[PDB]
Amino acid sequence: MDTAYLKNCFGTGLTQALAEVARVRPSDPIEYLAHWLYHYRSITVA
Amino acid sequence: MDADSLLLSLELASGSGQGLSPDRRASLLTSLMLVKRDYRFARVLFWGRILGLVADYYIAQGLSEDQLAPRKTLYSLNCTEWSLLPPATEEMAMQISVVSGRFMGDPSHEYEHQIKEETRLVSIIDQIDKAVAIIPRGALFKTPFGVTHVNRTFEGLPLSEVRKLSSYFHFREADFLDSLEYDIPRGSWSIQMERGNALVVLRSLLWPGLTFYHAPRTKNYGYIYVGTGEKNMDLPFML
Amino acid sequence: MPLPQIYVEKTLALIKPDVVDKEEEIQDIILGSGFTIIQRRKLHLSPEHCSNFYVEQYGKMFFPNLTAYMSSGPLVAMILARHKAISYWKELMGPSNSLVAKETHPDSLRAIYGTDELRNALHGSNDFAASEREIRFMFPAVIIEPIPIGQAAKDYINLYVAPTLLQGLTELCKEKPPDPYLWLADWLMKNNPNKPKLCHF
Amino acid sequence: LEVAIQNAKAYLLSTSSKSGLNLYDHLSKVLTKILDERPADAVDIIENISQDVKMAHNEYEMLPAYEIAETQKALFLSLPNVMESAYYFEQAGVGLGTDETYRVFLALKQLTDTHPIQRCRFWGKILGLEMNYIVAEVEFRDGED
Amino acid sequence: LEVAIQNAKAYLLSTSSKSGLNLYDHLSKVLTKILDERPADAVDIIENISQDVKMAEYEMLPAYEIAETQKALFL
Amino acid sequence: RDIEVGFLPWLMNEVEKSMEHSMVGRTVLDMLIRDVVERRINDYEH
Amino acid sequence: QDPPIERDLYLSLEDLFFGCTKKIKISRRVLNEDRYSSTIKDKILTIDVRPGWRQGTRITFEKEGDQGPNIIPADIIFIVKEKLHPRFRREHDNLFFVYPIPLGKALTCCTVEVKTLDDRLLNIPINDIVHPKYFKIVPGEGMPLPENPSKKGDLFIFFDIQFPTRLTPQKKQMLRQALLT
Amino acid sequence: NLIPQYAIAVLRSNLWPGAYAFSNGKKFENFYIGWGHKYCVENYTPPSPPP
C-alpha cells in the first residue's frame, strides 16, 4: 500500500489538524483544515 | 513621545530646553487625538520638530499593533492641521545626499543641487528613526504571533541598568532589537541624570536635538527629536 | 456531567441598535446579577447574516422588520455564564414579546429597554443546544461545548471531513508531489464541496 | 464552593482583547503537551513551552474622548492676558494649569468673537457635581446679544 | 480515562532536582496570583508570572546627596 | 488506491487518543483550579 | 448541454474591501425523478466574498442551476462587478481618486481630504504645482490584494482643475505679473 | 499666534543653535540653551597646519 510514504510525510500534522477541527466544530471544516496546515508550516518550517 | 508628554512638559523636563509651548501642547493633544481618530493608529506619538528657517514642522508618527511596522509619519506647520507625510524609501534617501542646509518652513521649497523639501522631511525623519529612535530594555516584547506589542508589564530599568547603553534599543527592525552599545561612535550617546535621579535623559550626539525620556520608577518613557534636522558628521572630531 | 469534571453553563446575550446606546447599564445589571462576561464584540449584521443567524427559525419568522432591527446599526453580543445561566437570563428577560413584558413584568429588562414585539431590547439563548448553535455562529473559534471524545468525533469527521480528505489524499498518493502539504491544502481550498470554485482571473 | 469554582473558570475563560485566546484553553494545551512529552526539565520549560503553545468585516467602536476633541479643535482655529494672570495665580497654587487655562482662554476668544463685548474676563470656575462651570465676566458694547 | 488521570497526578511533579520546584505547586501559585483579578488579557501575562514564582537602596544613594545639597537653596 | 481501509482507520484512532490526551489535560487543569481555590477560601477565612 | 447563466451581481467598494457575504435566490426549475416537475430544493446560494476580488472574478456553483431532464445543472452566480462610488475607480488593486481642486489651490500648497474605504480620513499634502496630468500616489493604502488580504495596493489621487470663469482686469494684471515672469 | 495681540517676539539666531532673544515690545532678555557650538552648513574642517 501507499501507507509508508504518507506515514513519513504527514504523521502528527493531520492528527492535530482534525483534533482541532473536531474540537472547534467550525462551519467550514475543510477551509479550517487548509488554513491550519498553512499555519502549521508557518510555525514549524520557520 | 505619547500623550502623557503633552499633559505635562516632559520634553522640557529633560533639560534639553527645546519643546512645545502650552499653546502647542494643548493644540497637539486635541490634534493627535483627532489623528488617532482619522488615521486608525494604535497610538499617535509626537515625533518632534524640524526647526526651519521660516516655520517649524511639527511631526507625528502613527503606531500600529505591530509597533515595529513601517511607522506612518505626519507633519503639520500650524500644529493642528495634520497631513499624512509619504513613506520613505532608499531612492529618496540617496536623493537628498547632495543637499545641505537648514529646512525651510514651506515644504514646497526647491533646491537646485530639483528636490522638494517634503522629500527632505521624509528622508531626514526616516534617517533619525533608523539611527536614534530609542526604546528602553524590555519595554517591547516580541509576541509569539510575529508581532511586537508593548510589554505592558514592563517595570522601569534598575538604576544599575540605567547607566549602560546596552539597556537601550534602536526602535526599528532587527530581546529582538539592536542595542546602542554598537552605535558607532562609541561615545555617540550622552547619559545624564536630572530631577533627583528619578529621570534618565539620553541625548543623541550624532543627531542633535534628540532627547530620550525615562522614569526608572515606572514605565514612563519616550523620545522626541526637537532640533535642526541635520546629521552631526563632526561627531568624531567633537568627541 | 457526573464526571470528575465540573461544568460551566453558557448563554448568548444581544443588544439591538436602538438599545446599544444603553449598553453600559445593561452590562452593569448583568454583572451585578452574578453573570460573568467571557467576550464582547461589536457586530453589524447585513441581511444575509440576519437570515443565517435565525436559520433555525428564519423559515417561519418572515419579518423584514426583524431583519432591519438587526441591520439598522450595530449590535452588542456577549457570552454570559453563571450558575443556571440560561434560566437566570430568561428570568431577567421575561417573556419574549415585550408588549406582554411591559405590563406584567415591571422588573424585566425587556420592559425597561424594549419597545414592542419586534423591537425587543435583548435576544439570547432559549435552549442549551440553541446556545451552542448561536454562540458558534456569532463568535467563531471559542470552545463552549463538551468535547466529542468518543465515536461522535469519528461521525463528525466521516460526515463532513473524510469524504473530501480521503479523495484529496488519494490524489496526493497518485501524484506523490514534493512538499506534499501544498498539494493537500491547495486542493482542499480549491475543491471544497461546501463552497464554490473561485477563478481569480 | 461550587459557585467559586465555576466563577474561577468563567474568569479564566475570558477571551483576551489582543491575542483572541483565553487562559483556560492555553493552560489546557500547555498541560496537554507537557503530559505528552514529559520534560525532566519540567519546570524550566514552562516558559518556552508556553511560547510554543502561543506559536501554534470588522466593526470599530471608540470612546467619548474624541467628541470633546471634535469640539475643541475650534478653539485652535478684547480679552485680558489670561495666561499671564493665571501664571501670577499659579505662583501660589491657584489656577487650572496651563493647558486648561489656555483652553478656557480660547473659549473666551470664541465668546468675544461671537458677541460685541468690550471686556471679557475669566470670572472664575464654580465646581459642580456632574459638570463644572467656566464663568466669563462680560461687559457689552452695543447692549445687543 | 481514570488510569490516565491517575498517571497525571502521579507525575506532577516528581521533583526536578535541577530547580527543586513542582509543576503542581508552581502552577498552583501562578493560578492563585492570577485569581486576584488579572484582566481578560491574562493569557499574555503568564510568561512572567512564571518568572516571578520561579524567582520566589544604596544604588540610588547619589539621589539623596543631590537632594541634600539642594536644601540650602531654600533654607 | 484503497487508502479508505489503509490509513484513515489509524488516523481516526490517533484523533481519538489525542482528544483523550486533551481531555486529560483539561481535567488536570480543572483539578488545579479546584486545589488552588479551595485552598484559598478555606485558609482565607481562618 | 444548456449553458450556465452568467449572472452579474454588483458589489460596491466596501463589500469587496471588508469581505461581505451575499445571498441570491435561485430558480425553482429543479426536477424530481418524474422529469416534468418544477420545484426547489435549495432556495438560496451564499458566497463568502473575500477582500480584494477583482472585476471578472468568476464564482461557479456546479449542479445548482436550471436543469432539464437529461443535463447537469450549473450556474455562475456571480461575475464580480463594481458600483459607482463618490469616488474611487476600481483598477488592478489600486484606487483612483479624483479631487476637484480649484485653480490657485492647484498651483500652491494644498491638502486633499480623502475618506477611505476603512472609514479613515486622509490629509494628503500636495506641494507640487498641480498641472492637469499630475497625480500623487498614497502607497500601501488601496484595496487589499486577493492573494494577500493583509497587504493592500496604492491609492492614486488625480486632479480635475477648476479654472476661473471670470477675471477682473486687476486679476488679469495680477496673473500676468505672477505667471509670465 | 492664535492670540497675536498678546504675542512675544521670538528670535532664533541660526548661527548659535539654542541662542534666543525675546521681547514683549518694552523689555527684553537673552538665553542660550544649545550645546555651545556655532552652526555651519559645511562639515567641520580641522584647520590646515602652518605652511
Swiss-Prot record, chain B:
Disruption phenotype: RNAi-mediated depletion in the ependymal cilia results in a near complete central pair apparatus loss and alters the ciliary beat pattern from planar to rotational. Multiple radial spokes proteins, including those in the head, are markedly down-regulated in the cilia. It is found in: Cytoplasm, Cytoskeleton, Cilium axoneme; Cytoplasm, Cytoskeleton, Flagellum axoneme; Cell projection, Kinocilium. Keywords: Cell projection, Cilium, Cilium biogenesis/degradation, Cytoplasm, Cytoskeleton, Flagellum. GO terms for cellular component: 9+2 motile cilium; axoneme; extracellular region; kinocilium; motile cilium; radial spoke; radial spoke head; radial spoke head 1. Functions as part of axonemal radial spoke complexes that play an important part in the motility of sperm and cilia. Essential for both the radial spoke head assembly and the central pair microtubule stability in ependymal motile cilia. Required for motility of olfactory and neural cilia and for the structural integrity of ciliary axonemes in both 9+0 and 9+2 motile cilia. Belongs to the flagellar radial spoke RSP9 family. This is Radial spoke head protein 9 homolog. It comes from Mus musculus. The lineage of its organism: Eukaryota, Metazoa, Chordata, Craniata, Vertebrata.
Swiss-Prot record, chain C:
It is found in: Cell projection, Cilium; Cytoplasm, Cytoskeleton, Flagellum axoneme. CDD domains: DD_NDKH5-like (cd22970), NDPk5 (cd04418). It comes from Mus musculus (Mouse). Functions as part of axonemal radial spoke complexes that play an important part in the motility of sperm and cilia. Does not seem to have nucleoside diphosphate kinase (NDPK) activity. Confers protection from cell death by BAX and alters the cellular levels of several antioxidant enzymes including GPX5. May play a role in spermiogenesis by increasing the ability of late-stage spermatids to eliminate reactive oxygen species. Keywords: Cell projection, Cilium, Cytoplasm, Cytoskeleton, Developmental protein, Differentiation, Flagellum, Hydrolase, Spermatogenesis. Belongs to the NDK family. SMART domains: NDK. Does not possess all residues considered to be crucial for the NDPK activity. This is Nucleoside diphosphate kinase homolog 5. Its EC number is 3.1.-.-. Expressed in the trachea, ependymal cells and oviduct (at protein level). Expressed predominantly in germ cells of the testis. Not expressed in testicular somatic cells. One of its GO terms (biological process) is flagellated sperm motility. It holds the Pfam family Dpy-30.
Curated annotation (Swiss-Prot), chain E:
It is found in: Cytoplasm, Cytoskeleton, Cilium axoneme. Expressed in the trachea, ependymal cells and oviduct (at protein level). Abesent from sperm (at protein level). Expressed in brain, kidney and testis. Transmembrane segments: none annotated. Disruption phenotype: Mice show hydrocephalus and the tracheal and ependymal cell cilia show clockwise rotation motion instead of planar beating. All three types of radial spoke heads (RS1, RS2 and RS3) are missing in the tracheal cilia. Belongs to the flagellar radial spoke RSP4/6 family. Component of the axonemal radial spoke 1 (RS1) and 2 (RS2) complexes, at least composed of spoke head proteins RSPH1, RSPH3, RSPH9 and the cilia-specific component RSPH4A or sperm-specific component RSPH6A, spoke stalk proteins RSPH14, DNAJB13, DYDC1, ROPN1L and NME5, and the RS1 complex-specific anchor protein IQUB. Interacts with RSPH1. Interacts with RSPH3B. Interacts with RSPH6A. Interacts with RSPH9. Functions as part of axonemal radial spoke complexes that play an important role in ciliary motility. Essential for triplet radial spokes (RS1, RS2 and RS3) head assembly in the motile cilia. This is Radial spoke head protein 4 homolog A. The gene is Rsph4a. The chain holds residues 206 to 291 of 716 of the full protein.
From Swiss-Prot, chain F:
It is found in: Cytoplasm, Cytoskeleton, Cilium axoneme; Cytoplasm, Cytoskeleton, Flagellum axoneme. Signal peptide: none annotated. Expressed in ependymal cells (at protein level). Component of the axonemal radial spoke 1 (RS1) and 2 (RS2) complexes, at least composed of spoke head proteins RSPH1, RSPH3B, RSPH9 and the cilia-specific component RSPH4A or sperm-specific component RSPH6A, spoke stalk proteins RSPH14, DNAJB13, DYDC1, ROPN1L and NME5, and the RS1 complex-specific anchor protein IQUB. Interacts with IQUB. Interacts with phosphorylated MAPK1. Interacts with MEK1. Interacts with PKA regulatory subunits PRKAR1A and PRKAR1B. Interacts with RSPH1. Interacts with RSPH4A. Interacts with RSPH6A. Interacts with RSPH9. Interacts with LRRC23. Functions as part of axonemal radial spoke complexes that play an important part in the motility of sperm and cilia. Functions as a protein kinase A-anchoring protein that scaffolds the cAMP-dependent protein kinase holoenzyme. May serve as a point of convergence for MAPK and PKA signaling in cilia. Belongs to the flagellar radial spoke RSP3 family. This is Radial spoke head protein 3 homolog B. It comes from Mus musculus.
